[PDB]
Amino acid sequence: GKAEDKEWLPVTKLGRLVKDVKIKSLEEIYLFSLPIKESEIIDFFLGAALKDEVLKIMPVQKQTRAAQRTRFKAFVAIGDYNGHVGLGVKCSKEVATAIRGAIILAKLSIVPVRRGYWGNKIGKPHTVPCKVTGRCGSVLVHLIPAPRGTGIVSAPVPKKLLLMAGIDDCYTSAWSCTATLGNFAKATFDAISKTYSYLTPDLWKETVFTKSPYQEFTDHLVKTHT
Amino acid sequence: GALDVLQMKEEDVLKFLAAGTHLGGTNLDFQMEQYIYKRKSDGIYIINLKRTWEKLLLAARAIVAIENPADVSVISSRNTGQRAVLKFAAATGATPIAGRFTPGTFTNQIQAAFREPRLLVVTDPRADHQPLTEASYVNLPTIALCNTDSPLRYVDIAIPCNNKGAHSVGLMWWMLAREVLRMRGTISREHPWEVMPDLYFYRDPEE
Amino acid sequence: MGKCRGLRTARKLRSHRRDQKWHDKQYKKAHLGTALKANPFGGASHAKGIVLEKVGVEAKQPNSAIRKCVRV
Amino acid sequence: VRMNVLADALKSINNAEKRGKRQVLIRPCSKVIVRFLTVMMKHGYIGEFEIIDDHRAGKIVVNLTGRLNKCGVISPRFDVQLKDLEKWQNNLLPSRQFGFIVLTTSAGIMDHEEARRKHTGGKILGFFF
Amino acid sequence: MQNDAGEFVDLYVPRKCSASNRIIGAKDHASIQMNVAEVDKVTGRFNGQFKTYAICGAIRRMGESDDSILRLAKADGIVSKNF
Amino acid sequence: MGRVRTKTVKKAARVIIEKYYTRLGNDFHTNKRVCEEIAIIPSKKLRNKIAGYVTHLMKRIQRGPVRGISIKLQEEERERRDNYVPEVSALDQEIIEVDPDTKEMLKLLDFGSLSNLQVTQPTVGM
Ligand SMILES: [Mg+2]
Ligand SMILES: [Mg+2]
Ligand SMILES: [Mg+2]
Ligand SMILES: [Mg+2]
Ligand SMILES: [Mg+2]
Ligand SMILES: [Mg+2]
Question: A196, C57, D58, F81: which has the fewest C-beta neighbours closer than 10 Å?
């Protein structure tokens, strides 16, 4: 019937440089640590590879004068299988609104993961590059490198984010109240996010500052429209 | 800046001494300690003016490096600043914000005042804490006119000056508007600018 | 907040652990022997007996029944 | 009352790298600390350093770059036997591609990747990664 | 970050703070990328080139981006000592 | 009684004055007709209350400016006072003179004229 979709008129200086192809891929949106605020930028460079996996639907409820008003908290992980992942949380009055709304957050929070080698470099890194630790609430999670072919060794929950981040082999440990799925998943996501901010003897070469896209595309943004 | 054509000339020294920008407060920071020269024999500190000049030309070089002039948002909330920043928007193409700031102006894609600058000049870091702690969310450099006692946190180029409410606030903004225009090449150096600083001073009770 | 770490402290460590094991209930009843002496079996898995009589015991609330037991 | 002088030196350097400083003062000092800092410098984890005479134990000023991540001491100097060395560099080190165990041997104060080369074990001092 | 063939295997290469030398991960919305103009030294006018500086988030929120930028400017022809 | 006008009466009366300021005089029965002509108020009772707040606002605006209404004729008198003030054709001058500890601050910046001196009463404030 009707066709010729037009939606997503951007609302940001980044939405303009991304909708028009003037920006290549996330690796320059990350290089300047810019904040993504639209749920479509990720759907642009990805989408052909992203998967959504609901982890839990938890009914919480507050006490009210006459009654106990209950809402649902839906934990949704997301990620391709080549080095990106994200995990979002949203609470709402009905179970569909929460699941629809959490996917937008989990997209809006995708981070890059850095996979390294265990013993010798035979192409295509496979496990974490070093020993990483991450906390939330009382939960602590520790991720350790492992030799090729061992497969992830963890509880069922972290063996859903570690797989969707693209890490094949990994050894793990956890401490305190792992039962609470909230803290157990934010702890894992944190220990993954820490992978690119661990300085290693290979990242010692002095850095060469290029120019940010807010400077290189200052013309296209001046002209065209505010 | 190191050369001669950028060194402080003896008439600017007399403007500075007339506005009293060298006069500081009674307190201090452990961060503004390198800008002080000494403390007077009644309890007040004195600001080294050559350091003022060097920090001024550093901020000028930070503003000049922005291609579109229209994203150098200039904020000021207190009265003694408002009139000044409005003239700055006239001098160079910047964008003024004088008055209350309405939290969330930088970080809310829904508000009608949502503007995304690339720099941020601001008077008085202690009375404009809100724009600072909101610049801390979107990678926004900062420039500010501090004092002997102004907390340095989320500011980058601190131009020491009185700014306690004086002719000194207007004088500082005017001199900063002169040096941006000069080194961008829109007016010529060592021909005195036709504008007069008093266009930037505040309305004390009129007449 | 303090545990001897030095290079010749092994006597203290061992003699202190050997003591603190006795506060662990599950270890204590394996080794005091007063449990095995008091066990109504012999410390075996099963035992033969002769049925003295048949009783019913009322279950603990909330749920309710009469539970049909022998006394041996 | 200051039983272990290397422990203070390494904790002092470490409490200051995290803060972001550019120079640190260590006091007292010793032949052992000076040898240890040399091992930490031949590999590039700190910059050059300067020793102050004062007719007592001296003091050291060290120039830090940001490359350092942790350094620490193993408090009883346990013995290690080149067949129990792996069980140490697999417990203390973060990954088999960087980091060093520093130990004292009859052939001087060295790092395990060299003790393996000269075929000798000895007493463990610390680690840095 | 290479392997036994040489070809780099990395999503990207983060940039380090110029005052603390700690890499700037891609969720640090306080790290800034200051960009300071050159002048032509004879007329006192801006001319193309400029010098870029990176400053971490943690040293920015401990009140030290100021003196850091100052030393980084003094280290070059932007202040030339004698301050 | 009450007589506390609702926010739907205090917003009409604010837009109307901005758009039509030169009609809205100072009596009520003429405003009650102007307001009926310009806007569409779907009641008599509401029309009168709107036209009755308009008169209050008009009486107030024939004094200083009110902080909800930006009228053209009263912007320019502020625009004037920002463009320049009746006080001076000179700057507030460079010819101003100061006291010690600043002569030595300039002695290390090289100034040599137009100053004064007075070593202040000899202990900190009291
Ligand atoms: Mg439990
Ligand atoms: Mg529960
Ligand atoms: Mg007891
Ligand atoms: Mg019991
Ligand atoms: Mg037990
Ligand atoms: Mg029960």
Answer: C57
Q: Is A34 part of the contact surface with chain B (CB cutoff 8 Å)?
A: yes
Chain B, chain F: beta-carbon pairs less than 8 Å apart = 64
Distance CA D82, CA B127 (A): 64
Domains and CATH numbers, chain D: 1-68 (3.30.1370.30), 69-129 (3.30.1490.10)
Q: How was this structure determined?
A: cryo-EM
User: Cβ contact (<8 Å) for A199 and D96?
Assistant: no
* Contact residues on chain A for E52, CB-CB shorter than 8 A: 209, 211
Q: Are C53 and C69 in contact (CB under 8 A)?
A: no
Q: In the structure, do chain E and chain F come into contact, i.e. share 3 or more CB pairs under 8 Å?
A: no
For residue A139, give the nearest of A179, A197, A170 by alpha carbon.
Answer: A179
Residues β-bridged to residue C70: C54
Say if CB A60 and CB A139 are below 8 A apart. no
Q: Which domains does chain E have, with CATH numbers?
A: 1-82 (3.30.1230.20)
Q: How far apart are CA B37 and CA F78, in angstroms?
A: 41
Two tokens at A70? 């209950």
Q: Which secondary-structure segment (H or E) carries D59?
A: strand D59-63
How far apart CA E41 and CA E76 sit, in angstroms, is 14
* Alpha carbons A60 and A71: distance in angstroms, whole number: 6
What span, in angstroms and rounded, lies between the C-alpha atoms of B139 and A214? 12
- Tell how far the Cα of C24 is from the centroid of ligand 4, in angstroms: 11
CA distance A146 to A159: 15
DSSP F73: H
Q: Do D95 and A131 touch (CB under 8 A)?
A: yes
**Element spanning D99, H or E:** none
- Return d(Cα F9, Cα B72) in angstroms, integer: 40
At residue E36, φ and ψ (nearest 5 deg) are -110, 125
- Most F CBs within 10 A among B4, B7, B8, B10, hence the mutation to make, goes to B10
Cα separation of B131 and B113, whole Å? 14
Report which of A150, A149, A167 is spatially closest to residue A158, judged by C-alpha positions. A167
Domain F7-62, classified CATH 3.30.1330.200, yes or no: no
Q: How many CB atoms lie within 10 A of CB F107?
A: 10
- In the three-class reduction of DSSP (H, G, I as helix; E, B as strand; rest coil), residue A171 is classed as strand
- Give the tokens for residue B69: 């002039």
- CB atoms under 10 Å from CB of D120, counted, come to 15
- Smallest Cβ distance to A123: which of E3, E10, E15? E3
The token duo for D34 is: 């000076």
β B96-98/B74-76 pair status: parallel
| Element housing B132 (H / E) | helix B129-135
Structure tokens at A103: 């996917």
Exposure of F107 in the CB half-sphere (CA atoms within 13 A): 6
**Taking the alpha carbons of C29, C34, C39, C45 in that order, is the dihedral positive or negative?**
positive
Burial of B9 (0-12, 13-18, 19+ CB in 10 A): exposed
CA of B114 from ligand 5 middle (Å) equals 60
Non-local CB neighbours of B167 within 8 Å, separated by 6+ positions: B18, B19, B20, B197, B201, F92
